[PDB]
């Protein structure tokens, strides 16, 4: 009805290709699947044949060392759902040492219930950025896509599709050049969708044949029976593998088949939770009544012996192996090898273990910051022990700084010392707390107190700043007087400090960092006392290197000698954000004075060199400056102010055309104190029209050939006049120009032309200011007499 | 008194607490 | 830091808060 | 007069009153006298007393905020001279921050032997600007009188009489009841008594008899046996150039000090032997040392604690240290350089050494003159070296840039995990502790952890050089388990040195001096290597290669390293000659100065030069006048702890998945001239033209014989100044008298124009009238060969002509007198 | 090297035999 | 089994043949 | 392109071995 | 660090000197 094939048992295929024929005689594979060591295939072996069966695989997939496999569709063009009941090293799909995969072939698998994909050792792989991992992966368990060709270029993750942006890729999503991605709503992505891209029923999984119908699907989410996806089945039928239902005959048949053991792994079948399980979970005694898990009568502990008498866990697969067990015989090793966080899954799969008769090694943690996987271990028999007599081993651990609660969980270690070495992230506080609870009462163990607590905050006492005084240059701190019970352990304090713009400073881990690094530690000398006050009752430190108006996050720790005591592990002061006072507004930067007109000057300036406090206002001062006067001894022939708050540009208005000006720009953060004045100067452009001779040249003629000239200075001289270009011009003669100096002009109210000749003359005069040249005045006429 | 102990070597908080009266 | 003359006087005034200034 | 009482040694009276009374019995203050730290006295907790025996203080007198002191007549009313053989901030009399002192009470103080005096921040003191210093000192610049109430003239001044010989202010005085003494010109500056008489030169301060050596209050040159002598026979040595102390007295001072240990030299019982003398033993004889020997600054009672870099500055300029040191400083950028500057000149330490609870270091070598630790002072338990509570350490002292030997005390290496065992073994071997029948105590159980101690050598198989790169290749290296290899982290640095080690520089928290490059594991055999990404031509670099390896719980290493190699990159052309400056000071003298290339690329054989000739512009005659490495992504780029941890965790995860899969998969059976300048930043050129431009090309060259490869062209143009031979008309002025009154004024152009002629100013003045200006343009001059006076009125016309040009001005041709006739 | 692990191990074992297969679990 | 003998220590050809069946 | 790995990024020893013929 | 044009061709020369290169 929903699966076009039989239900085959899990298969393992190595070398021979003949067994692959069985993949075409059934479309359901209960168990896992592995195809490896396929050293006899060629490209013509994966392109002239294709298996049209295989819809769902209950546990996982494992393709390794496959020769000439270039696409996933070449083998199964219809695989839709991987249930993920079991994993393979925290994975539900693995690609390893593949040297012939150049493109994918799966387009109907949209959800992985448990696990992840392990793509590794591929150097011809294409199309791995168009797979929409977010859409497919709805669970993430250390998903690592490494050793591929998409960090280099083979094809360039491009194909000729919906092209949706959901992983951060703006390129077309596809699986082959002749195929495109299939999208469905996320609201309908955890229950699977149809092949039209629309929502599907919630009792179906993966691909569907009728949108929003449980009567016709290709997989079921709860159970498959009657060829329709249902939520439960009658109990004359028992759920097997949790994807279907089957009558009691199959269950009793399996039980009888294992009655006489000839199968290495089979367990006599029984039924609990209306399922024909292999063995009842702990708490239910395996006694047939009709192959039903009857209630336990008295203590029924399940002694689950472990291989090697020790078991290391770095994957959830090994953890689920021992689920449903109460008593454990043997030891274990905790080793978090990279990956994502697993503590929640660890407690989910091992939180049912209440007794261990061995020791427990811990090494290289990378996901445990707090131990929370055992909330039932109350009795540690310790019948097996490490040579050294340690029932606990803590080595090379740099991620753990916490331990299980001690008011709801107990642990009484009956034998063996507690090993704790080279664990600086783990604090001695919890170490001694457990030394006291376990007792192996109270007994001193061989634990190095100089190797644990060096890169973590393990203080247990506490300080509190009693007297604090803040100033722009001196910050004094005075915390509560504290000395350990042994008054010879105090070796000083640790004034931790660092620059903070705003309070975002989280307390440091507890290691020692100095130089230019964050949270600069500063050792403080011991007070040299008996903890009795001699002249002080508040110990602290007055740091004085501070600059005006700057906030620093500062806390203080304590260094004391170690001892075998529970206490005397140092103290810790609270964190404070001490903002210093502002007393300088700072010098302004880059003043730019530029004249844009003859009466308009634009000023500029940059924010102060150091921002101290809120700038209450900007202070400016300027006044009219005069030019230098030298034309009377040589010859070439308060103050206006404006206050602008939070402004970086100002314009001066009211100035006269020409003459220098001086401006001073100061920053102020009060209203008052200001910074040192900054000097800049510019002059407005001179008006050449204002320098033009006004009124006509009058000619006081006297017959000495003395034609005295009466001309007038410009309407508004620019500064003063250098000289006058009195260019008289006699027609029918060579042109002339006379340099009438300023002194001569003042002395004679102009000039007095002498040495002339009689006749019609025409004089043009051009007055020249200090800067800027005017225009020639009209050519006044005069008839010089003799 | 305090000049010879804070102008020849760096000064300390407790050094100033003993000459404050 | 180094405290001399006026700087030392200022520091002694500010740092102490339980007794008057002596120097 | 003679000292009535017995001498007493210097004392520091703080919070005590009995000690103040003790000064009465004293007659000579042999040492300094400190009156300080009186926070318990009030004006109702003091008294007035007179010390008739005290007559002199051998050293400076220090007053420090003494409460209860209203005047200076309460402690000493008889002091006369403060010699000040010792000094405090160069002042022989120090009164710092003293208040409630309204006046002074001295009556016999009239001289100072040496030093200065400090009177500052005294806003309640009077009579401090009414004291002459032409008789007390030898200058007026040896006393600082500021921030005083009498330096503002706000004090009230009174004096005895309207009888004092003294000359607001009225007379030179110190108190209403006391004054200063002024005496005649036949006296001297060695003091004069209150009576108004003079005193001899052998006397000091006041004196009992005028000009008598036998009777003096104090002797400036020497004092001995009851008479003022000018020398000290043996074995009496010159003491503070004021007396004679026998050898017994100097030895007693020596014994009581170890005040500074007293030394004998120059027949003087001086405190310290001058530089250049070694301390002869059992006589303390400062015998001339062989070579320059830095003064030995002994340690008080043989101990010195160092917890900050400020104390490390107390060893500057010393060689021998008498005692033990405890270096436990933590923190600071480039701590090793600081310690090397602080104590790099300490030749030996007679004490023990402790490196307990130390941090912010990577090596222990911060000495450069030590080759032996005496170890005379021993730690409890027979130990001379100490290393405790340290979490980071990568080395000890090397044997090819430092030497060391130990003659006593055991070794101690505790809680030093990164300190490899081999380093400890080498220390035990070279130092010789085992050789002298001694057994050390170590903590090797907790050492050799988290540090590579087993290494392998990498042999270079092929290497070539270019002008800005160096290709390196080494013999294929693979750890026993190839999975251990994670790649290589190459570390290079610019090293001119030939004994380069990876401990040069840094050795502190957050400081580094070695650049790093990362290379991936070699492929599957391909010889691994790395090609530098450009370099400086003709420069050598130190390069080595380390190998990352998987680590076990305690410690595991498959590591290998390379030796230091100094490979030089071939040379290329050099850069532009920095700062070309062709400056002239005459019209025939130009100096061409330049700086060497910014990038020389090998020694510069010579400097190439080129220049072209120019000429006056013709236009003037026709003109009339009347992501990338440059931006950076890391400027030092070390691998962080988080990165190494992530790398190791992922490598381990991969290996675990591999082994896991393998265990279940497999089962057993069932033309321009040129010039060359060699080694010179200057050039002299002479015999040039005036007002002529010169454009000079400048390049630098690093090779001459094999091929000419030089810097890219550099250009600079210098214009010579114009000589002045164009200020007046050169040659005569051709003119003729006509009846038309037209005076066509001809004249020849000067020998050279010096560029161009701006104009010619011609002044025609009948009977010497006003001097006119007439623009004679270039074109008008060429057309008319000068000017043309078209008509003039009858009269003796004087004509002056000035050749106005850029050659200068300020002189006119003498006026030609022509009497025009119509 | 001279050690057999991971890729080296599989590429060193396949050399021994490839026509008889491996034991079936 | 294979890793503990082949990776930890050197495997001879006899060890490799163990897994050939 | 070769510029993507060598101009925009840094090419290592073995990186340039793929651009040689 | 980065390589382009002349620097890249010189690198392709020094790196690959036993066999020809291409750019």
UniProtKB/Swiss-Prot annotation, chains C, H:
Effect listed in the UniProt record for changing residue 21 to S: In HPRI; Los-Angeles
Domain of life (superkingdom): Eukaryota
Consequence the record notes for mutating residue 7 to D: In HPRI; Providence
Protein name: Insulin B chain
Parent-protein start and end of this portion: 28 to 50 of 110
Curated annotation (Swiss-Prot), chain D:
Superkingdom assignment: Eukaryota
Effect of residue 200 to R: In RMS and LEPRCH; Winnipeg; may impair receptor processing
Effect of residue 31 to R: In LEPRCH; Helmond; inhibits processing and transport
Residue ranges, Extracellular side: 1-670, 671-822
Effect of residue 447 to S: In IRAN type A
Parent sequence residues shown: 28 to 946 of 1382
Fibronectin type-III domain residues: 576-651, 729-822
Reported effect, residue 710 to A: Does not affect S-nitrosylation
Listed result of changing residue 86 to P: In LEPRCH; Atlanta-1; abolishes insulin binding
Disulfide bonds: 8-26, 126-155, 159-173, 164-179, 183-192, 187-198, 199-207, 203-216, 219-228, 232-244, 250-269, 257-259, 273-286, 289-293, 297-318, 420-453, 626-775, 701-710
Span list, region Insulin-binding: 658-666
Name of the protein in its database record: Insulin receptor subunit alpha
Source species: Homo sapiens (Human)
Residue positions the entry lists as glycosylated: 16, 25, 78, 111, 206, 246, 280, 322, 382, 403, 499, 585, 603, 796, 809
Curated annotation (Swiss-Prot), chain E:
Outcome recorded upon mutating residue 8 to D: In HPRI; Providence
Outcome following mutation: residue 20 to Q: In MODY10; reduces binding affinity to INSR; reduces biological activity; reduces folding properties
Domain of life according to the entry: Eukaryota
Name under which the protein is recorded: Insulin B chain
Species the sequence originates in: Homo sapiens
Lineage: Eukaryota, Metazoa, Chordata, Craniata, Vertebrata
Section of the entire sequence shown: 27 to 51 of 110
């Amino acid at each position: 009805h929903l699966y076009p094939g039989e239900v085959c048992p899990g298969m393992d295929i190595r070398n021979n290709l003949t067994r692959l024929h069985e993949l075409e005689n059934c479309s359901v594979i209960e168990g896992h699947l592995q195809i490896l060591l396929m050293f006899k295939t060629r490209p013509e072996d994966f392109r002239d044949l294709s298996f049209p069966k295989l819809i769902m695989i209950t546990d996982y997939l494992l393709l390794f060392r496959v020769y000439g496999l270039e696409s996933l569709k070449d083998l199964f063009p219809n695989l839709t759902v991987i249930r993920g009941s079991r994993l393979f090293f925290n994975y539900a799909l693995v690609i390893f040492e593949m040297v012939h995969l150049k493109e994918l072939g799966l387009y109907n698998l949209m959800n992985i219930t448990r696990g992840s994909v392990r793509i590794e050792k591929n150097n011809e792989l294409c199309y791995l950025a168009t797979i929409d991992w977010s859409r497919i992966l709805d669970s993430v368990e250390d998903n690592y896509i490494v050793l591929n060709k998409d960090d280099n270029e083979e094809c360039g993750d491009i194909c000729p599709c919906p092209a949706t942006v959901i992983n951060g890729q703006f390129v077309e999503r596809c699986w082959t050049h002749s195929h495109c991605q299939k999208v469905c709503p996320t609201i309908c992505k955890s229950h699977g969708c149809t092949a039209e891209g629309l929502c599907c029923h919630s009792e179906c999984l993966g691909n569907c044949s009728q949108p929003d119908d449980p009567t016709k699907c290709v997989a079921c989410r709860n159970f498959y029976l009657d060829g329709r996806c249902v939520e439960t089945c009658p109990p004359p039928y028992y759920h097997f593998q949790d994807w279907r239902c089957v009558n009691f005959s199959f269950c009793q048949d399996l039980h009888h088949k294992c009655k006489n053991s000839r199968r290495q792994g089979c367990h006599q079948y029984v039924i609990h939770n209306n399922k024909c399980i292999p063995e009842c979970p702990s708490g239910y005694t395996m006694n047939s009544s009709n192959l039903l898990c009857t209630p336990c009568l008295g203590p029924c502990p399940k002694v689950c012996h472990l291989l090697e008498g020790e078991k290391t866990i770095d994957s959830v697969t090994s953890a689920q192996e021992l689920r449903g067990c109460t008593v454990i015989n043997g030891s274990l090793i905790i080793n978090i090898r990279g990956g994502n966080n697993l503590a929640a899954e660890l407690e989910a799969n091992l939180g049912l273990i209440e007794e261990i008769s061995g020791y427990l090694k811990i090494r290289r943690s990378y996901a445990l910051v707090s131990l929370s996987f055992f909330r039932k271990l109350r009795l540690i028999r310790g019948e097996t022990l490490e040579i050294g007599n340690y029932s606990f081993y803590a080595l090379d651990n740099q991620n753990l700084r916490q331990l299980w609660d001690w008011s709801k969980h107990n642990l009484t270690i009956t034998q063996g010392k507690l090993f704790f070495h080279y664990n600086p992230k783990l604090c001695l506080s919890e170490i001694h707390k457990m030394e006291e609870v376990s007792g192996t009462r109270q007994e001193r163990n061989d634990i190095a107190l100089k190797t644990n607590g060096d890169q973590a905050s393990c203080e247990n006492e506490l300080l509190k700043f009693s007297y604090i005084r803040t100033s722009f240059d001196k910050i004094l701190l005075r915390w509560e007087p504290y000395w350990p019970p042994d008054f010879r352990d105090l070796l000083g304090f640790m004034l931790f400090y660092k620059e903070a713009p705003y309070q975002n400073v989280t307390e440091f881990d507890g290691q020692d960092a100095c130089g230019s690094n964050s949270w600069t530690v500063v050792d403080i000398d011991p007070p040299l006392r008996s903890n009795d006050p001699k002249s002080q009752n508040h110990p602290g430190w007055l740091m004085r290197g501070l600059k005006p108006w700057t906030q620093y996050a500062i806390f203080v720790k304590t260094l004391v000698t170690f001892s075998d005591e529970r206490r005397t592990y140092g103290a810790k002061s609270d964190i404070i954000y001490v903002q210093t006072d502002a007393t300088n507004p700072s010098v302004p930067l880059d003043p730019i004075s530029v004249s844009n007109s003859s009466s308009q000057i634009i000023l500029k300036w940059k924010p102060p060199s150091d921002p101290n406090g809120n700038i209450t206002h900007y202070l400016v001062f300027w006044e009219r400056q005069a030019e230098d006067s030298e034309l009377f001894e040589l010859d070439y022939c308060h103050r206006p102010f404006e206050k602008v708050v939070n402004k970086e540009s100002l314009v001066i208005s009211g100035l006269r055309h020409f003459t220098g000006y001086r401006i001073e720009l100061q920053a102020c953060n009060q209203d008052e104190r200001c910074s040192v004045a900054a000097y800049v100067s510019a002059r407005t452009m001179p008006e050449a029209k204002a320098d033009d001779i006004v009124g006509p040249v009058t000619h006081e003629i006297f017959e000495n050939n003395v034609v005295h000239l009466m001309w007038q200075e410009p309407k508004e001289p620019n500064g003063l006049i250098v000289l006058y270009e009195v260019s008289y011009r006699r027609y029918g003669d060579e042109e002339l120009h006379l340099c009438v100096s300023r002194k001569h002009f003042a002395l004679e109210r102009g000039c007095r032309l002498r040495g002339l000749s009689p006749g019609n003359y025409s004089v043009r005069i051009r007055a020249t200011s200090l800067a800027g040249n005017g225009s020639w005045t009209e050519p006044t006429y005069f008839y010089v007499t003799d | 008194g305090i000049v010879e102990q804070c102008c020849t070597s760096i000064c300390s908080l407790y050094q100033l607490e003993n000459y404050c009266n | 830091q180094h405290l001399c003359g006026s700087h030392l006087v200022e520091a002694l005034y500010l740092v102490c808060g339980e007794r008057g200034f002596f120097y």
